[PDB]
Amino acid sequence: AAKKHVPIVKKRTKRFMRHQSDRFKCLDSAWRKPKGIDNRVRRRFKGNLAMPSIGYGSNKKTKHMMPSGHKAFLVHNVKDVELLLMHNRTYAAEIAHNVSSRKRIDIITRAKQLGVKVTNAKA
RNA sequence: GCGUGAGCCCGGGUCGAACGGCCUCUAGUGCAGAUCUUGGUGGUAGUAGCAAAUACUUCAAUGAGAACUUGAAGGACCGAAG
Ligand SMILES: [Mg+2]
Ligand SMILES: [Mg+2]
Ligand SMILES: [Mg+2]
Ligand SMILES: [Mg+2]
Ligand SMILES: [Mg+2]
Ligand SMILES: [Mg+2]
Ligand SMILES: [Mg+2]
Ligand SMILES: [Mg+2]
Ligand SMILES: [Mg+2]
Ligand SMILES: [Mg+2]
Ligand SMILES: [Mg+2]
Ligand SMILES: [Mg+2]
Ligand SMILES: [Mg+2]
Numbered sequence: 609a610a611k612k613h614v615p616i617v618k619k620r621t622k623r624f625m626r627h628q629s630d631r632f633k634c635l636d637s638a639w640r641k642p643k644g645i646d647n648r649v650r651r652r653f654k655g656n657l658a659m660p661s662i663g664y665g666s667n668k669k670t671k672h673m674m675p676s677g678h679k680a681f682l683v684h685n686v687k688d689v690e691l692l693l694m695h696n697r698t699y700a701a702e703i704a705h706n707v708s709s710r711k712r713i714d715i716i717t718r719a720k721q722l723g724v725k726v727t728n729a730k731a
Numbered sequence: 732g733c734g735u736g737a738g739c740c741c742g743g744g745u746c747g748a749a750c751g752g753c754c755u756c757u758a759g760u761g762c763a764g765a766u767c768u769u770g771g772u773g774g775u776a777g778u779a780g781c782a783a784a785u786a787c788u789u790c791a792a793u794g795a796g797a798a799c800u801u802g803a804a805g806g807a808c809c810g811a812a813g
């Protein structure tokens with residue numbers, strides 16, 4: 609179980625999609641700030657896409673925290689997962705994607721010994 | 732799943748030989764436009780159309796397949812500045 613923490617509030621779950629990326633396939637959905645002189649999104653017309661702002665920033669107490677209350681730490685081996693020995697209530701280990709199956713099993717066993725949560729343990 | 736965001740990480744599939752994090756150093760380093768360059772691909776669309784030069788028809792053979800292959804017969808044109 610994670611450390612006691614204030615409830616996690618996101619202030620927003622949507623992704624801030626790029627303007628007209630829904631209409632043009634040459635445009636990736638990744639956010640781009642519209643620099644056009646006449647742009648309605650830039651000028652903040654009612655009923656349009658919202659632009660990201662620092663006001664959407666998450667609470668400093670719960671930033672980078674997954675819903676279980678843990679912060680993800682990427683591990684590539686057993687020695688990496690052993691760095692979380694003193695942090696099993698604040699940090700959860702995420703096994704790197706390019707780790708072989710046997711090394712994944714070793715990391716999972718060591719994390720079970722240490723009491724460290726693994727976010728992608730099932731395989 | 733994380734980040735306000737650019738982005739980052741993971742699960743599954745495909746795949747087959749290299750690759751990444753951190754601190755510095757470096758630059759031919761970030762694209763929707765430029766009637767931009769090269770290449771590829773659409774709707775239009777099975778659409779416009781394939782209509783000058785009189786014209787083809789019967790039987791048989793060949794052949795998987797015959798109006799525009801061939802034989803025979805008929806009907807026609809060029810009509811000696813052909
Ligand atoms: Mg978000
Ligand atoms: Mg103006
Ligand atoms: Mg090879
Ligand atoms: Mg350049
Ligand atoms: Mg382009
Ligand atoms: Mg531009
Ligand atoms: Mg072109
Ligand atoms: Mg075309
Ligand atoms: Mg037609
Ligand atoms: Mg015509
Ligand atoms: Mg015709
Ligand atoms: Mg004719
Ligand atoms: Mg026959």
Ligand SMILES: [Mg+2]
Nearest residue numbers: 786787798799
């Ligand atoms: Mg004919």
Ligand SMILES: [Mg+2]
Nearest residue numbers: 785808809810
């Ligand atoms: Mg005549």
Ligand SMILES: [Mg+2]
Nearest residue numbers: 807808809810
């Ligand atoms: Mg005559």
Ligand SMILES: [Mg+2]
Nearest residue numbers: 810811812813
């Ligand atoms: Mg003469």
